[PDB]
Design a protein around this ligand. Structure first.
Ligand code: HEM
Ligand code: HEM
Ligand code: HEM
Ligand code: HEM
Ligand code: HEM
Ligand code: HEM
Ligand code: HEM
Ligand code: HEM
Ligand code: HEM
Lengths: 144, 147, 149, 140, 162, 161, 145, 147, 140, 140, 147
């Protein structure tokens, strides 16, 4: 149920195998979002500034890499509880300036799980992953 | 009970997942959690290892202990495709444990479980049965001539 | 259900064990390599020396004994080449035990030595091998022999 | 002159050429066989490990314990504090035997030799040769 | 090598002396079925052909070459093999159309599906022939004339039947 | 194709990543990646294999059986559709007429047509189904050490009618 | 025929090595011989009632056949030393002597090995060479010329 | 008459059947039967080879003769894939036969038959024509400068 | 200490590494090229075979006659009686030329060298090194 | 005794073993590494090119300029007239530096060494060794 | 402007057609025609190169000039698959041109054209665009300061 400092590095290893090199990454991004929007149709309104109407437009592709790019930093360091809280706290002020219900990034949680499972080599522990990214979710929300 | 063969290939992959790096950040944190799990069931052993300043969990020294345990343990595994060089290096590693006091034959059979209770939480695909079988024939050959 | 002597091991054995007989003739090899195994036994346990009177062990190079040295390795050989397809091997060795049964004065503790000779004797005569593998299989052959004693 | 970047490179190249398993033993024994052909006296201290014939086992065992040591050393070579600790414990093992201070300086010459053939033209000699000194001096 | 997969749904790998035996040694007993025992290929008088390229000897330039089966016997007690005799014949190119004629004997193996022959003895220009019928039908082939010792590939000709 | 990419081209090859087959909308400019979203294996379907060769020896069975408790589709994102499967094995020896039916859960992937079974016991033997893509009465699926990715034992399954 | 022809003695010694091979084909190479023999002499199976010789694919019998080849390997192995052969061979006499074997049978078991060897072997061998050597062994076990 | 090429590959297999072993039991018995077949047609030659105690068929010495004949003869064959090293080693092996008395040019052309006489009886598949052609050009280059 | 078993092994390993045909000549010439780089004076006695340049033919011929000798030796190495006979005849060939007794002891050092690379870590040094002595002493 | 037929052969064999591209640099650096292990003093004059560590670049650059020279030499080795011209210009570059006349005679010994392994048993030593002298003397 | 990569493989083949030989007959005649084409547009440069006896078209010396130009030029190309060894050897080749009088930064940019006007007649398939682009970044760096 907690980050379980051993289990913390479990996902740290798995994530490396899933989030890969090459242009598949750009494809690995598309999956997550195409999954998310199908759960919450009206969440696209929040992206009017990034051309989030259609998801295949080049301006949007850029947006999604930064998202993974950002999330890579998070999972990269669960070893140092200091630097995480520093780096993570940065993301708070990013989202804080607009209205994100606690319903959405519960669904974006469900989205990453499924996509990872497919992309990954048939073996991973859900309840291990479930905890760690949820710790990050408690982070950006700003309060637990 | 018969290390067999396929069990060894089973190991060589399992061990390659935990050991893969040129940095020591990971190899440390894993093995430290082995003993940290050991001492919870045999607090008497903790009275030993006083030479290394055990009392400090994060010492500038204590790491320099566990690090040599790994590189010693990893030294075993990379011999399994070539035996007869194991015995020699096995017998050596045995004698380094009889020259001190407070090493009980009961302690080894304990840590056999210590990996099994907490070795996987690091990996995903893992064979408990294999790792448990070929590990005794390593340890049951250390405690032979020791009390 | 036996874990011991798993399938993958004896494949290694048969491959290594076959490196000796890559050479043609080979009669002289296993005569000589067999002549050592029996003599080197007598100099540990002297008691067994009496048992070989019928074959005239007193002559090491003697023809009458030499022909006996073949049939021990050759009898061992068919055992190794038959390791796969187990249910036959049980019957194969069963017939050897009974063959040692009618002979009197054969003590179970002898084989325990004969293994230790061979287990440490073998590593001299081969290029490479995994001692762990051979250890498993020869416990299979030897232990099942003498089960009649 | 060893620091930060020029150290980091030695780690990556240590991973590759050092190999694994049966390929590791073959690496170690290929090292010593260099120096013993060059400096015949060096086999005097090894009478404990039967260094009569290096190809024999039990020395094979030894030479692997050797290289394993460099792993511990080179692996922690980033964090300066904890480095000295192993270097401290290491020297202790070499106090009680007859050595010359020149054999050490000889060792690194013939070690960086063998890495040549496997890495061909690709590596920083400067990085190695100086940063193996920071390992070797701690033994004196 | 030294074994031949079975013919059926589920591929097994069975030793070559156990086909057309009169005992089922497979899972399904593929070895008893006339999709295998059929002798249509070594019935006496059949003849294969197709012009040969020579790589190793004689350098004659491509000219026709036939194999023919003069007499076949199958022993009642060891039905695994069909013993047979043949005559290889290929066109030397001199002036008039002429042919040297080796004479052969050998066995036909139901496993490999490959008949293989050899020169008899005291026969001019001693060659041997290896025909593999691994294609679908019992006609066509991929043969090769070989030297009888090394099984070294003297001349390769992809042969049919008329 | 390249690595994890999938080849949709009928007459004019178009190379697309694996995660977009049965994605829910048109990515392949042919339109040939959306035709296939019908799942082939329906609950109650029962497959029986015969052995090809076996070195991973638990019981080294003559032949083994496989049944579907229930297929299920995660609604929103469906390239992958998870499964419950029994695996029945009816052994025999000197002594015993032992039995087995271990339950497990795999997933069938519309991408490369493979189905997987995650190890039923702790022994770490994954069963890797592979259809050809046009047939669905038989698959050549074979067992694998989940950690090592090595082919150990094959079976040729058939659907029963 | 030839009297073992001490040169020709080693001819078969070489060929035999190429035929009698390594691996599990040997177990198969055994089956051939017997399946061949019994088809020549149907009533010879009576002699094997002790070894479960009713059906020939039963495991208990497979063991029996290897010893037979295993035994015969020893024979052909040594035709060099006329002493050790006569010693080793003479052993086989007392093996068979305790039961009734007509001179008809192991004439047929002679015919059996020939055919099987030819198939198993690489298209080239001299019959009249083989014919002599194993027949010398047959004169051996029979106990008298 | 033209050793050619294919004939040499023909040899290299034929020779590999007779020579295959690390023991000398076989290589001896074959070559001994060569001369044993030679002396039957030229008993005069038997008056030579007195240095080696020829009169004892099984001597502790005489073997040590024939053994060097083989290893010398086998030394020829393993050069046929590389010529120009043959001539040198051919010319050498020639001169070692002119330093003695009683070696007639007629004797070599005799043993040419001696193998053809009885070398087949050891092998099964054998090419008489090939072995006979490439063997002369070996021997007819030994008797060149010799009476 | 050379015996029935520890001798047998040398035969099997002699078969493998020694190779065949064009591979054999390449083996021999790779041997001498070792020792002549080490001990330059050794080329004095070879003026008969034009040992000026080893890569030239006629020496190539020689060095093969050499190794062929070891075959005769090592091949009969089981039967002790007949062994001495060849060793007897062999020494006779070396009586009439200028040698030092130290070159022999040098030879076996550099021969067992070259077999190292082809056999890697697999063989008994003890078996070779002692059982080549039983060949070398018969030449004195 | 050279310059004709026996010269021509050196050209053909120069083409093969010398290789190309990344394979060329690997050839040069494999040469010097021979001689510096043999004659340690030789690295004194290279302080200009940082011959401290040969594996470092800028020496890699140098040693290729070296071999490139032999190309110019050996390439024109047929036409005798124009040969001396390059040999004339070449020596001029070596006048202003501290050398010994024995290092040259050393060089050709260790160059024809390395070509041995790549060409095995096939070449005329006599052709090379004498016809590299016609290159080396022009430098004195 | 960006040598890129593919352009270099384009070169490596082009250069392999002109350079292929162990004789110097061809490599000379090509490069001589480069300067012979150069001097027609900058006769002032011809006043330099007096040290090498330029005045003789056919000299026993002048060839020994152009030959070293090629082997120097060819030395560049065979480094393009391995950079960082170029700069070092580039900077060197630069300084050998500043130690003399009469280097026109202007003349380097001249010979850039000189090949482009005398290449397409020796070869058949030729890429003008490629050879012209990757050649400047060579010459533009050997005329880095001035001269
Ligand atoms: C683990 C979950 C998430 C992480 C790590 C994450 C991270 C980030 C990062 C790194 C940026 C980059 C901003 C920049 O470069 O300037 C960003 C932007 C953004 N994120 Fe997220 N995010 C997450 C979840 C969400 C969710 C669930 C939503 C909405 C439902 C959301 C909405 C946005 C928006 C609208 C922006 C762009 C704001 C702008 O362009 O002004 N994010 N996010
Ligand atoms: C399970 C596998 C184990 C291995 C492979 C192993 C190996 C080693 C090695 C190589 C050293 C360093 C020796 C040296 O530097 O020469 C060491 C130190 C030590 N080990 Fe272990 N060890 C193991 C388990 C244990 C256990 C279970 C105990 C006690 C319960 C123990 C007690 C010690 C102690 C006390 C030292 C310190 C030696 C000193 O005081 O200097 N070890 N071990
Ligand atoms: C390890 C595998 C062994 C095998 C395969 C084996 C095989 C044989 C066989 C087959 C025979 C009978 C020969 C026949 O029936 O004609 C035999 C005889 C005999 N073996 Fe063994 N043997 C083995 C080990 C031993 C050992 C360890 C001993 C004694 C310590 C032993 C003592 C004997 C004796 C005394 C005979 C009596 C032979 C006679 O009466 O002439 N064997 N062995
Ligand atoms: C260059 C880094 C070196 C390291 C890291 C190193 C490390 C070690 C280690 C770990 C041991 C064994 C401790 C044990 O088994 O518990 C040891 C023993 C030994 N080392 Fe080294 N060593 C090095 C260099 C050398 C060199 C150059 C020599 C030269 C002769 C040498 C000679 C020995 C000897 C003779 C022993 C045996 C001590 C004994 O068995 O009593 N070492 N070394
Ligand atoms: C070259 C020909 C033959 C050889 C070398 C041979 C050899 C042997 C050998 C070595 C055994 C093993 C005895 C043991 O381990 O207890 C044996 C058993 C036997 N042989 Fe043969 N044999 C030959 C021909 C025959 C023939 C033709 C028959 C019958 C038609 C026959 C009948 C038997 C029987 C019945 C046994 C088993 C007796 C028992 O179980 O007590 N053999 N033979
Ligand atoms: C056919 C191929 C032959 C070959 C390759 C051959 C080769 C050799 C060789 C290598 C030796 C030993 C020389 C030495 O130790 O230095 C030898 C010895 C001898 N050969 Fe031959 N030889 C052949 C045939 C013959 C024939 C046909 C005769 C006589 C009819 C003959 C007469 C001798 C004699 C007398 C010696 C003994 C030299 C001595 O007394 O020490 N050889 N031969
Ligand atoms: C190690 C085992 C050795 C063996 C088995 C051996 C054997 C032989 C043989 C067979 C010959 C030629 C006889 C002939 O052509 O008829 C020979 C010649 C020669 N051996 Fe050795 N030799 C050995 C060691 C040595 C060594 C260490 C040297 C050192 C220089 C040496 C120097 C020579 C020389 C110079 C000749 C030439 C005789 C000549 O051309 O006239 N040998 N040896
Ligand atoms: C064998 C034929 C040799 C040739 C063809 C040759 C050619 C050359 C060339 C072309 C240069 C550079 C000229 C330039 O960069 O413009 C040079 C420089 C040099 N050579 Fe050689 N060389 C040879 C032998 C030697 C030897 C044996 C040495 C021994 C140490 C040597 C030492 C040097 C040194 C130190 C330089 C550097 C000069 C400097 O940095 O100013 N050379 N050589
Ligand atoms: C385009 C590429 C060029 C390259 C790669 C090149 C390279 C070289 C080289 C390597 C040398 C011999 C240097 C030595 O022996 O140390 C040389 C000589 C020379 N180069 Fe160039 N060169 C080029 C173009 C030019 C041009 C365009 C000029 C003048 C317009 C020029 C003027 C000279 C002169 C005068 C010499 C003779 C040096 C002397 O007087 O001793 N080069 N060049």
């Amino acid at each position: 149920k907690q980050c379980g400092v051993l289990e913390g590095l479990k996902v740290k290893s798995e994530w490396g195998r899933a989030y890969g090199s090459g242009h598949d990454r750009e494809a690995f991004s598309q999956a997550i979002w195409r999954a998310t929007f199908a759960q919450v149709p009206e969440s696209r309104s929040l992206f009017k500034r990034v051309h989030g109407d259609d998801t295949s437009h080049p301006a949007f592709i850029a947006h999604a890499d930064r998202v993974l790019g950002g999330l890579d930093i998070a999972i990269s360091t669960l070893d140092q509880p200091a630097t995480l809280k520093e780096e993570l706290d940065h993301l708070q002020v990013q989202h804080e300036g607009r209205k994100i219900p606690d319903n959405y990034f519960d669904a974006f949680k469900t989205a990453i799980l499924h996509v990872v499972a497919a992309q990954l080599g048939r073996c991973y522990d859900r309840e291990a992953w479930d905890a760690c990214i949820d710790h990050i979710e408690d982070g950006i929300k700003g309060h637990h | 009970d018969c290390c067999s063969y396929e069990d060894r290939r089973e190991i060589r992959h399992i061990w390659d997942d935990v050991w893969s790096s040129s940095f020591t950040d990971r190899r440390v944190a894993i093995v430290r959690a082995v003993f940290d799990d050991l001492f919870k069931h045999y607090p008497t052993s903790k009275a030993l290892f006083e030479r290394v300043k055990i009392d400090e969990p994060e010492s500038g020294e204590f790491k320099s202990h566990l690090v040599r345990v790994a590189n010693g343990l990893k030294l075993l595994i990379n011999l399994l495709d070539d035996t007869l060089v194991l015995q020699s290096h096995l017998g050596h590693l045995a004698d380094q444990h009889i020259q001190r006091k407070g090493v009980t034959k009961e302690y080894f059979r304990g840590i056999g479980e210590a990996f099994a209770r907490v070795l996987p939480q690091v990996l995903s695909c893992f064979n408990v049965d294999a790792w448990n079988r070929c590990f005794h024939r390593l340890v049951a050959r250390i405690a032979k001539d020791l009390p | 259900h036996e874990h011991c002597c798993s399938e993958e091991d004896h494949r290694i054995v048969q491959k290594q064990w076959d490196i000796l007989w890559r050479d043609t003739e080979s009669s002289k090899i296993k005569i000589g390599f067999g002549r050592l195994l029996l003599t080197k036994l007598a100099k540990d346990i002297p008691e067994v020396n009496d048992l070989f009177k019928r074959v005239d062990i007193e002559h090491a190079e003697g023809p009458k004994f030499s022909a006996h040295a073949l049939r021990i390795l050759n009898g061992l050989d068919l055992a190794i080449n038959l390791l796969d397809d187990p249910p036959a091997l049980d019957a194969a060795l069963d017939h050897l035990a009974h063959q040692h049964e009618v002979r009197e004065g054969v003590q179970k503790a002898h084989f325990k030595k004969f293994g230790e000779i061979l287990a440490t004797g073998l590593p001299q005569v081969l290029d490479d091998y995994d001692a762990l593998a051979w250890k498993s299989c020869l416990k299979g052959i030897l232990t099942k022999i003498s089960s009649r004693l | 002159e060893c620091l930060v970047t020029e150290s980091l490179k030695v780690k990556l190249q240590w991973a590759s050429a050092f190999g694994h398993a049966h390929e590791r033993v073959a690496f170690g024994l290929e090292l010593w066989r260099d120096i013993i052909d060059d400096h015949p006296e060096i086999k005097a201290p090894f009478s404990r490990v039967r260094g009569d014939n290096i190809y024999s086992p039990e020395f094979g065992a030894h030479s692997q314990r050797v290289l394993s040591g460099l792993d511990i050393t080179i692996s922690m070579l980033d964090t300066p504090d904890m480095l000295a600790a192993q270097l401290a414990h290491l020297k202790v093992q070499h106090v009680e035997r007859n050595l010359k201070p020149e054999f050490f300086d000889i060792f690194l010459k013939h070690l960086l030799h063998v890495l040549g053939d496997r890495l061909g033209t690709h590596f920083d000699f400067g990085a190695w040769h100086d940063c193996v000194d920071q390992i070797i001096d701690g033994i004196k | 090598e030294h074994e031949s997969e079975c013919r059926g749904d589920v591929p097994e790998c069975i030793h070559d002396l156990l086909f057309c035996d009169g005992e089922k040694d497979c899972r399904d007993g593929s070895d008893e079925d006339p999709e295998t025992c059929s002798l249509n290929i070594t019935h006496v008088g059949s003849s294969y052909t197709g012009l040969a390229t020579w790589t190793s000897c004689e350098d004659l330039n491509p000219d026709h070459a036939i194999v023919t089966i003069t007499a076949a016997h199958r022993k009642s007690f060891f039905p695994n093999r069909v013993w047979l005799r043949a005559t290889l014949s290929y066109e030397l190119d001199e002036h008039d159309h002429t042919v040297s004629t080796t004479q052969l004997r050998g066995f036909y193996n139901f496993g490999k599906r490959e008949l293989l022959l050899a020169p008899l003895k005291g026969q001019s220009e001693g060659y041997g022939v290896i025909c593999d019928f691994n294609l679908g039908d019992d006609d066509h082939a991929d043969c090769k004339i070989v030297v009888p010792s090394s099984l070294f590939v003297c001349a390769h000709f992809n042969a049919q039947r008329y | 194709c390249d690595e994890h990419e999938h080849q949709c081209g009928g007459d004019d090859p178009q190379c697309i990543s694996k995660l977009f087959v049965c994605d829910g909308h048109n990515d392949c400019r042919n339109g040939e990646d959306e035709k296939d979203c019908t799942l082939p294996t329906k609950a109650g379907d029962k497959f029986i294999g015969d052995v090809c060769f076996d070195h991973c020896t638990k019981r080294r069975p003559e032949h083994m059986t496989l049944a579907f408790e229930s297929s299920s589709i995660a609604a929103f994102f469906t390239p992958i559709a998870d499964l419950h499967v029994h695996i029945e094995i009816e052994s025999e020896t000197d002594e015993d007429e032992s039995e087995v039916s271990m339950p497990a859960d795999g997933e069938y992937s519309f991408a490369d047509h493979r189905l997987t079974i995650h190890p039923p016991e702790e022994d770490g033997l994954g069963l890797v189904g592979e259809f050809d893509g046009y047939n669905f009465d038989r698959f050549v699926g074979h067992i694998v050490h989940e950690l090592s990715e090595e082919v150990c034992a094959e079976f040729i399954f058939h659907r029963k009618k």
